[PDB]
Write an enzyme that holds these catalytic residues in place. Structure first.
Site: not given
Ligand SMILES: [Mg+2]
Lengths: 1022, 205
Positions: A101, A200, A356, A390, A415, A417, A460, A536-539, A596, A600, A603
């Site tokens: 991630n 990720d 994605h 992205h 990216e 991260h 990110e 982003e919102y409301a995962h 790993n 997560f 998503n």
């Protein structure tokens, strides 16, 4: 022969070096397709000139680049297998896929990379037509490659390509020979460029995109640009296109632009080469600008594509045409005015889901069908806007959006991260050239498409000097599209519109140097004018979208807020095969790639295969354009739509009582965009019988759009009618319950039925029918539910987090708490027998909850349970308060009256509506890659399973799997149904959440902190 | 005033090298590399991205980078007519105070007029004025008279401090200054190169 030989070519290595993105690579241009015929370009028929290298491809795999044989370039290795392309080699199983991630999988020492990097070499042998070789220039094209590749043609080195997402073109004209020509390509999983993208997603290195051969006349237009200008009225739009022609220039040659709408052309443009006398030395020799004027032009919009077809043809004076280029044109004007993003003169509310591009069966490569399938769902689901995070989407994908509807936001493929500080890679001056290629290259290729309304430099990546420089470049090269960048807290200077990610509407949490505020607060900040759209919102991970209504409620409320893209459209999982060969979805490093991030990663709003997550329905209801307000009989409908009249919308209203509808009303709908339509029902029938009247209004389309089949439903609304309270009395029943008492157990007998309560236990172990036993396991109070993805958060056994809900419960001893009988008693009513049990749950000498339950038995023999629960203020709030029992009997269908039919939670019960519901028992359980409590139903007056009838107000989930079992299992496939059906009934249920997976996203109101709880239900036979 | 080492007088259109997206990485090094090395010095008051390179997308991107990496110094770019967005302060070159001559797409106005232009607030400094070649600086007083007169005008750098000439040796071996392609390099612009306020050796004109 050197320097063609591998040893010379490999070193100095390019990939290790930050600075050189590619060697000998032609500049990016929007695809033309190179077709000589004028009709074909207007027609869009597949070009003869274009050639596809797609097909079976020879493949060889080596652990390191040094390892691969020098000899191979001359000839394909005997051993190597043939693998379809485009393909991801890891998908083939040569190398296990690695997913992380935040961390780059490779150790972070920019720009250096691990000494052994998995390398796959693809050799393709093809025959080039003789006609191609004699005239024109032929360049091989790769739609996508990862991370980086070295290109050899005919045993001769051709080029180096540094960016996987972007298409890279190399010219093979020198290399090609009559007859078959061998093609050798070398791909390395890890590149210097790899550092740039830390986004990720499952990481697969190989050629995941199509390879094709393109032929261009010696004189051809390398690039062309389409631009639109509109009057304030928008009645007349001026479109000017600039075309740049490669190589030789002829005074005689002229470029003609024709604009064709449907089958009939609107406007034609013809110009001599060169224009405008640009300052100061000279006018451009090879550039011609053509302006076409269109009046009353149809304007492209998410509701309507409204496409024009534009053909750019370069032809001789007489004249023959050397080449033809066709570009889809949509007339839309996107600008930010007064801090409000505006499209076509109308403020834009954007509902979008981050996409994605992933396929479980085929991994990274995307079938053409999948995009169409994906596109239909998003459009069907009330999603007009799609964002790809992205990286640039498949070249085909942009074309689909333009025809189909929805807005697209392009994202530069950067990216970072992993880097700490994260901004370091972007921030550094040296890294700018590598950074530039992704932003610069992307704009040229995707600039043409009508659909894209925005440019995003990075995701990110933090805030770096380069982003500020890059942001300036995009504006100057292209002024058409607003630029937004998430990084730096989203308050960064570079982003035209603020894009806070995972921001919470109600409350704000601030991390030093990266403050996050509620969206309402964030606009309000001193000296801030920018329109705000959430990245982003409301995962959607696991159970998700709780409090989703709240976000949308805010968006409608505020003019400045444009709404935000939901994350994420597709859960990311890879198919795995059992010894049986059955396919089970894999989350995290199932393959053993490490470390790993595991679960997560998925998503996902919708299943990969793909199927819709219970959550998706919730998104559709909130999203829907129409707004319904009801006063008395009258119903008022407000149109969400900016540009479209509801030409084909049908409104159907049904009124039913207690799951029964007395009347149904249908009205045609005719509302202009932003229009309000008032509909008045025929006076509703009045029912003397006790119950609650329900009014349901839903909008369906009589004629199917290309995305949606006819009879599809855009939106629905449910309103309670005035409540009816029944004073009718159950009493009285002649039969009287007779109770027999033993020290060991309490026994009550009425008629055939027998009820058993255990004194030691304090709960009633057995319910008796016949001649039969009703329940395997004694009924007991349950204060726990299998942890949701949100509750677990980032917490792990290796690295436990105090904040997570599961941790608080686990620390609490909430799970392990053992009930004790504080008191118990048996008493007999004249008409009924009443049993009172008091239980205290104690962990470590501290009592988490006290439960008092009284069971009263009717003459009828119907049983009523009243439960009182006391929760200590100190203890973390119980996830749910309910009593769970296991029943031996198994039933084909579950019938209940309550919110249905999709699983719903208190945080997100908006999607559900109240009606009688019938479902297959399997349906109640909701499949998840990771198993957490699921399938809960809320506001149900009555629940019916088999013989048993349940009456009261409660939330019930009925499934074969035990809650204990659900928490235990690593994966969904593993679970095996326990004999009988587990039944859970909850007086109150904690909200699912959550805005953020990492930290508890549950709302304050949703949590059951009351510290006092009361619920009652009735157990009735038949 | 530091200047990035980018010039593209030759290209037609001149802006093409700067303007192209591909050329940006090569362009970047001269501006980016220069800032790090010369940023420290107290003396420098300005950063100049390019000279006579025309106006290109890269200049706009480059100008943004200098501001973000360093906010200390104003950035001025001559190219694009000097009215370009990238330059913080207008730097018209060879502008005439009394009168203005305009070349399509590159209008030049008298400095008094140029500040006065609609929607213009930037302080104006000339890249060059009062060309010193041969007999030069005539009407020099007029330029300076204007500078004192107007608060906005900051004055401009004179061109050029040293005449450019290369020593040549006679059969006698006496040294005679050479102007243009005396050596026979061709085509030679010849005399125009020296452009000098003061003799090379140096002596004052
Ligand atoms: Mg990331």
């Amino acid at each position: 022969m050197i320097t063609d030989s591998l040893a010379v070519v490999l070193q100095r290595r390019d990939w290790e070096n930050p600075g050189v993105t590619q060697l000998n690579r032609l500049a990016a241009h929007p695809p033309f397709a190179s077709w000589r015929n004028s009709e074909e370009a207007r027609t869009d028929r597949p070009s003869q000139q274009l050639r596809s290298l797609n097909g079976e491809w020879r493949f060889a795999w080596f652990p390191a680049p040094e390892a691969v044989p020098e000899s191979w370039l001359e000839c394909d290795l005997p051993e190597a297998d043939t693998v379809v392309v485009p393909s991801n080699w890891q998908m083939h199983g040569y190398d296990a896929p690695i997913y992380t991630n935040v961390t780059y999988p490779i150790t972070v020492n920019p720009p250096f990379v691990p000494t052994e990097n998995p390398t796959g070499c693809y050799s393709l042998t093809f025959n080039v037509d003789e006609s191609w070789l004699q005239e024109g220039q032929t360049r091989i094209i790769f739609d996508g490659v990862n991370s980086a590749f070295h290109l050899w043609c005919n045993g001769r080195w051709v080029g180096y390509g540094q960016d996987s997402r972007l298409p890279s073109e190399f010219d093979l004209s020198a290399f090609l020979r009559a007859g078959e020509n061998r093609l050798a390509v070398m791909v390395l999983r890890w590149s210097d460029g790899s550092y740039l993208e830390d986004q990720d997603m499952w990481r697969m290195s190989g050629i995941f995109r199509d390879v094709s051969l393109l032929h261009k006349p010696t004189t051809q237009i390398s690039d062309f640009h389409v631009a639109t200008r509109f009057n304030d009225d928008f009645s007349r739009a001026v479109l000017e296109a600039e075309v740049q022609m490669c190589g030789e220039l002829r005074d005689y040659l002229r470029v003609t632009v024709s604009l064709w709408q449907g089958e009939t052309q609107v406007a034609s443009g013809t110009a001599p080469f060169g224009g405008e006398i640009i300052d100061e030395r000279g006018g451009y020799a090879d550039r011609v600008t053509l302006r076409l004027n269109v009046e009353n032009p149809k304007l492209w919009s998410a509701e309507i594509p409204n496409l024009y077809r534009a053909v750019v043809e370069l032809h001789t004076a007489d004249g023959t045409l050397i080449e033809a280029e066709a570009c889809d044109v949509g007339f839309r004007e996107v600008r930010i005015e007064n801090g409000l993003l505006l499209l076509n003169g109308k403020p834009l509310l954007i509902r979008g889901v981050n996409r994605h591009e992933h396929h479980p069966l085929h991994g990274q490569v995307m079938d053409e069908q999948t995009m169409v399938q994906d596109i239909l769902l998003m459009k069907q689901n009330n999603f007009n806007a799609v964002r790809c995070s992205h990286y640039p989407n498949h070249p085909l994908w942009y074309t689909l959006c333009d025809r189909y509807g929805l807005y697209v936001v392009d994202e530069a493929n950067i990216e970072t991260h992993g880097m700490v500080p994260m901004n370091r890679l972007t921030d550094d001056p040296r890294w700018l050239p590598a950074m530039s290629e992704r932003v610069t290259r992307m704009v040229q290729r995707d600039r043409n498409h009508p659909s894209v309304i925005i440019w995003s430099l990075g995701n990110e990546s933090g805030h770096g000097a380069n982003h500020d420089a890059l942001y300036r470049w995009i504006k100057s090269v292209d002024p058409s599209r607003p630029v937004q960048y998430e990084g730096g807290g989203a308050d960064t200077t570079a982003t035209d519109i603020i894009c806070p990610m995972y921001a919470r509407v109600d409350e704000d949490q601030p991390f030093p140097a990266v403050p996050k505020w509620s969206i309402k607060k964030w606009l309000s900040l001193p000296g801030e004018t920018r329109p705000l759209i959430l990245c982003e919102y409301a995962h959607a991970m696991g159970n998700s979208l709780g409090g989703f209504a709240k976000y949308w409620q805010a968006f409608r409320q505020y003019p400045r807020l444009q709404g935000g893209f939901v994350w994420d459209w597709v859960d990311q999982s890879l198919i795995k095969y059992d010894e049986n060969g059955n396919p089970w979805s894999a989350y995290g490093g199932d393959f053993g790639d490490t470390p790993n991030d595991r679960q997560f990663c998925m998503n996902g709003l919708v299943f990969a295969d793909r199927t819709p997550h219970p959550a998706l329905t919730e998104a559709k209801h909130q999203q829907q354009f129409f707004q319904f307000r009801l006063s008395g009989q009258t119903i008022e409908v407000t149109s969400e739509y900016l540009f479209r009249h509801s030409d084909n919308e049908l409104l159907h209203w049904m009124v039913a009582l207690d799951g029964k509808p007395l009347a149904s009303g249908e009205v045609p709908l005719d509302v202009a965009p932003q229009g309000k339509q008032l509909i008045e029902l025929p006076e509703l029938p009045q029912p003397e019988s006790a119950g609650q009247l329900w009014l349901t209004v839903r909008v369906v389309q009589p004629n199917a759009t290309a995305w949606s089949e006819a009879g599809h439903i855009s939106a629905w609304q449910q309103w309670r009618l005035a409540e009816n309270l029944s004073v009718t009395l159950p009493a009285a029943s002649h039969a009287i319950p007779h109770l027999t008492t033993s020290e060991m157990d309490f026994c009550i007998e009425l008629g055939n039925k027998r009820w058993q309560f255990n004194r030691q236990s304090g709960f009633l172990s057995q319910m008796w029918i016949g001649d039969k036993k009703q329940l395997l396991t004694p009924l007991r109070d349950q204060f726990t539910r299998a942890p949701l993805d949100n509750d677990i958060g980032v917490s792990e056994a290796t690295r436990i987090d105090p904040n997570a809900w599961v941790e608080r419960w686990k620390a609490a001893g909430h799970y392990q708490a053992e009930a004790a009988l504080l008191q118990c008693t048996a008493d007999t009513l004249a008409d009924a027998v009443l049993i009172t049990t008091a239980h205290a749950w104690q962990h470590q000498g501290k009592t988490l909850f006290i439960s008092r339950k009284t069971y009263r038995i009717d003459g009828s023999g119907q049983m009523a349970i009243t439960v009182d629960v006391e929760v200590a203020s100190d203890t973390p709030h119980p996830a749910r308060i309910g009593l769970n029992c296991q029943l031996a009997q198994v039933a084909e269908r579950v019938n209940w009256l309550g919110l249905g039919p999709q699983e719903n939670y208190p945080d997100r019960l908006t999607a559900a509506c109240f009606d009688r519901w019938d479902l297959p028992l399997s349906d109640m359980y909701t499949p998840y890659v990771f198993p957490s409590e699921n399938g809960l139903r809320c506001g149900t007056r009555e629940l019916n399973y088999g013989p048993h009838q349940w009456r009261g107000d409660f939330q019930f989930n009925i499934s074969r799997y035990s809650q204990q079992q659900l928490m235990e299992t690593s994966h969904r496939h593993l679970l095996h149904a326990e004999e009988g059906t587990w039944l859970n009934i909850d007086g109150f249920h904690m909200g699912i959440g959550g805005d953020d997976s990492w930290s508890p996203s549950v709302s304050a109101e949703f949590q059951l902190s009351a510290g006092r709880y009361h619920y009652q239900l009735v157990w009735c036979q038949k």
